[PDB]
Structures are given as C-alpha cells and as structure tokens.
C-alpha cells in the first residue's frame, strides 16, 4: 500500500536525521557515543512501543510501521556499529571492541526490557 511506504519513509527519515545529529554531537574521537546513544534510545523506545501496541490494539498498521519499522528502524543501526567494531579490531584494541559490542548488544537488550517495564508500571 502507498500509505505504508509513506509512513515508513517519513519515520525512517526522521529517525535517520536524529541518529545523524546524535553522531555529530556525541561521537567522540575514542568511542562512538553518538551511535551507542542512538541504539540505546532506540532499544528503549521499541520496548515502550511494543508494550504500547499490546495495550492499544485499536492502533492501525500505519502507526506501527511509522513508529517502529520507520522511526526506530532508522534511528538504530547495525551496519554503523559493525564498521565501528571492525575498525577497533584492525587497530588491535580488542578489549575496546569487546566493550563496545557488549555495551551495544547487552545494553540495548536491557533498555528494551526497561522499555517494557516502564509501560507496565504506568498502566497498573
């Protein structure tokens, strides 16, 4: 459907803009704080959205595609994280690369659980 392409296109554009600006303002010369922040916030917000969708089954598909598939799908990134991690590996800072992969993966999983829990606390 054309509405689905428009809802995903608008969200992904806004999410990518936010991720880019976060990189310009936070990415440091040593560690990519902008990329990590984008993934951690996006990981938290998808936990919020998943719990909000289950509590709002009336929400049609275009809200789902614009918010999650679009915005959060554009806000987070796996390729940027992968290239940043490979660049750390070829530099020899293995402990640094392991910390970045651990903070990105285990951190995003925790933020998603926190995103699920914050909605389940404000509804009861």
């Amino acid at each position: 459907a054309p509405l689905n392409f428009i809802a995903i296109g608008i969200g992904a554009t806004l999410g990518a803009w936010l991720r880019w600006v976060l990189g310009l303002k936070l990415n440091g010369a040593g560690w990519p704080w902008g990329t990590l922040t984008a993934n951690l916030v996006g990981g938290y917000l998808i936990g919020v959205m998943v719990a909000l969708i289950a509590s709002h089954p009336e929400w049609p598909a275009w809200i789902r595609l614009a918010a999650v598939t679009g915005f959060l799908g554009g806000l987070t990134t796996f390729s940027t994280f992968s290239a940043e991690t490979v660049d750390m590996l070829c530099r020899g800072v293995y402990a640094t690369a392991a910390a970045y992969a651990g903070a990105s993966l285990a951190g995003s999983l925790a933020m998603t659980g926190l995103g699920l829990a914050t909605v389940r606390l404000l509804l009861r």
Binding site: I46, M49, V50, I53, A54, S55, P57, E58, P60, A61, R64, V68, T69
Partner: protein, 87 residues
C-alpha cells in the same frame, strides 16, 4: 474496548488425549499465531490466516492452559488470550 488478540478462544471439541481449539480472526494483519499449551510448556505456530489448531499428545483428566499469541510482526505481539480445559 479490545483487550486481547485474538478476542475469543474456545475448545470446540475434545478427545481424552487431544483438543481442537479455535479463535476469532482479527481485522489486522497477523504474520503468525504462536500457541502454547501445558499443565496448569509446549509451543508451535500456525500461519496468520489460520483460525483453528489441533493440540494432541495430552493426558486424560489433566487440566491444561492454552495460550494464543497474535504476532503483527517479528518483534512484537498483542496481548495474548488464555483458556483452561481439562481433557
């Protein structure tokens, strides 16, 4: 308003060792339904176009909890619906 998806879940027919469950199809697009059953766990999946399912391999006189999850996408599902039934 709408709480769980699917909205209704019922055992339409039973056998000492098996059950036939059915649920109301939701207006929205369901990628797949995930069905869990166990003693009050085993899980399997039917495509989103299905509204019935066979649960077999049960023990007679045992009370089971049947839960159906409606996945709108790979990353999430609506609120599940659960029922209890003793074979």
């Amino acid at each position: 308003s709408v709480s769980s998806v699917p909205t209704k879940l019922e055992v339409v027919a039973a056998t000492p060792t098996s059950l036939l469950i059915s649920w109301d199809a939701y207006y929205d697009e369901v990628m797949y339904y995930r069905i869990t059953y166990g003693e009050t766990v085993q899980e399997f999946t039917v495509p989103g176009s299905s509204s019935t399912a066979t649960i077999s391999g049960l023990k007679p006189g045992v009370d089971y909890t049947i839960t159906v999850y409606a996945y709108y996408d790979s990353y999430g599902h609506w609120s599940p619906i659960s029922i209890n039934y003793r074979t």
